[PDB]
Ligand binder design. Sequence first.
Ligand SMILES: O=C(Nc1c[nH]nc1-c1nc2cc(CN3CCOCC3)ccc2[nH]1)NC1CC1
Ligand SMILES: O=C(Nc1c[nH]nc1-c1nc2cc(CN3CCOCC3)ccc2[nH]1)NC1CC1
Lengths: 89, 88, 249, 252
Amino acid sequence: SVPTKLEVVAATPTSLLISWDAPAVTVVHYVITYGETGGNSPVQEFTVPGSKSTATISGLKPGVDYTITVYAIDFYWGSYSPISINYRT
Amino acid sequence: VPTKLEVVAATPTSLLISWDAPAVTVVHYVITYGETGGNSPVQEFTVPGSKSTATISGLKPGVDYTITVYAIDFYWGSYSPISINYRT
Amino acid sequence: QWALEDFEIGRPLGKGKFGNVYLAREKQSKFILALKVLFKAQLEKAGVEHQLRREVEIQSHLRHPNILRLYGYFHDATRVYLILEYAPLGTVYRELQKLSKFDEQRTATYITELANALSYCHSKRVIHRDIKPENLLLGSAGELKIADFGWCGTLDYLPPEMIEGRMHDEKVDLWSLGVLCYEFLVGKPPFEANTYQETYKRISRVEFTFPDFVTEGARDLISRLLKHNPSQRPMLREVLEHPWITANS
Amino acid sequence: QWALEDFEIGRPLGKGKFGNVYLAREKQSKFILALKVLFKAQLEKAGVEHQLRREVEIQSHLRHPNILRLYGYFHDATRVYLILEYAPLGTVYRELQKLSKFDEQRTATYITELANALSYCHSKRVIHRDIKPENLLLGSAGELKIADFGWSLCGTLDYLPPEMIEGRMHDEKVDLWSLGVLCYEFLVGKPPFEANTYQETYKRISRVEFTFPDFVTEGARDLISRLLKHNPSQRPMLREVLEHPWITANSS
Ligand SMILES: O=C(Nc1c[nH]nc1-c1nc2cc(CN3CCOCC3)ccc2[nH]1)NC1CC1
Ligand SMILES: O=C(Nc1c[nH]nc1-c1nc2cc(CN3CCOCC3)ccc2[nH]1)NC1CC1
């Protein structure tokens, strides 16, 4: 599970701050996908520099549950095995 | 390289030398020996690179010999020899 | 997107240069396969990722019965996993270690498989495929399968236009093909010398000899394949139609 | 013959995982030199020790103003020392990483010098010279010097044509593709096919997928395009590249 420490640091009815433990390895960039869990509408993607260890997701509806999947991309060997966590807010 | 080169055993007719592993791939070793000081040109025979010992036969007793061995790298040639004196 | 939890790892098959290989079965399909596991630490210390990553893309577009299949790859924090076809009969390098050499029936057969695999690569404009005993596996039906990934050296199998530092073409495969045929019969590289300076000359001057137990048919083929001038070397189509292999296959 | 006891090793000039390069000078004459140290283990472990031994002989029987010289070599139990010419102004990589972009003349000038060497190398059958920024040094008079003496978002893939990456037949026409890539890098400040992953870049090279920013002049946009072509034969000759108007105008 790379990244490993995918968790929620801050949150709010408008936006949501996510974080993950530094991979201790060269990462080109992170791909984050989030959407209504349980098999709902398609997800939304956006990338994050490979140096950062956090990410902000804005424009969410309060109450719904979301599966936040974070992909760590390795230049040579593509993405690692992602890590997903559910969050309600 | 070789860094160490001692005489583990010997006889009045021949001698047996040994050296250490240089932590590097060696093609083979060239063994040269003769009366240390200068009586006549020395001899030269080769020993495979995997072996760490040799046997020089045909040495008279009571002759301070000077055996010199220098390894040979496959790509970069010979190493700096390491000479040691011994009295038969 | 494969993952380490998708396979039933089992008996180890060997120990490569940058890691070890295991035997496993695809959980969701029960398909057997070889799973090469290479430690990144050993890969980055020598800088060989791009050499293997480049070979992956080259062979990924190459799917021939005599070329080991690469179905996919995955990685983790400290290991890179290659999902490789299984070869129940082992590696040809093990055969030459157990037999010391091959009979003209086994060589002419292997030379016929490689000449085909090489011609298929030429069709895709791919040249200079390492076909040393290390990178040759034996499939189920005794089928020789090429496996170019990683894990003197390759110098012995280099033509005289590459050690000298000059442009080369598809004829480097005819050289290595003849060099390989010489080892299967004799069990030694024809241009194996003590030092680099010596190994270089023998290859640049073509200084090799045929033992007494080398027939005229084989001697003629090796002679034709081992030509200093790449233009003087034959064509893969002609090799397949050589009398020595048309009778020993 | 050479030995380690004939050099006054001055301050370092570079420290990496592949090797170290120290400032040095001949003792008898006090002649400034550059000593490049490499480890056999890494070379043997990677299968490059042969290539390194091949370059030493090749780069000893050829001299050129824009080609760094190899004044000899020696070795010990673990290391392999190379006696290299000194280059006061450093490598174009660092000078590029700082300024990011070069003048329209500096680029056209660098391309002019590199083209001459490649023709001098392509004549002696010495095809394919790695001329990435890391292997380009700057001399006292501000001139380039190709320094291909082993190792040193993407890596060495950004400078290879589709013939090399795909393992196909290559010839002296790969040098032209490199000039087009390097020329694009001096003006824009990044390889044209640079991407985020190895596969992404591999696809852009094999498909020749790149674009010119607006600030790229028209003259440079014609030479770089004439060099970055999939077919290696369609490319020009090192003589025609020297005759390109944009070069003859801004170069020096
Ligand atoms: O590519 C490799 N292996 C393979 C990819 N596909 N298939 C293999 C491989 N390696 C094989 C090795 C053996 C024989 N040994 C004795 C019996 O079981 C353990 C190994 C037999 C079949 C083998 N197949 N490298 C490791 C060193 C062998
Ligand atoms: O072979 C190399 N370099 C050289 C070959 N010939 N000369 C060099 C070299 N290395 C150079 C480094 C510098 C800048 N430093 C700060 C100012 O004083 C000199 C050192 C300038 C010029 C240099 N030239 N490899 C470089 C270390 C990665």
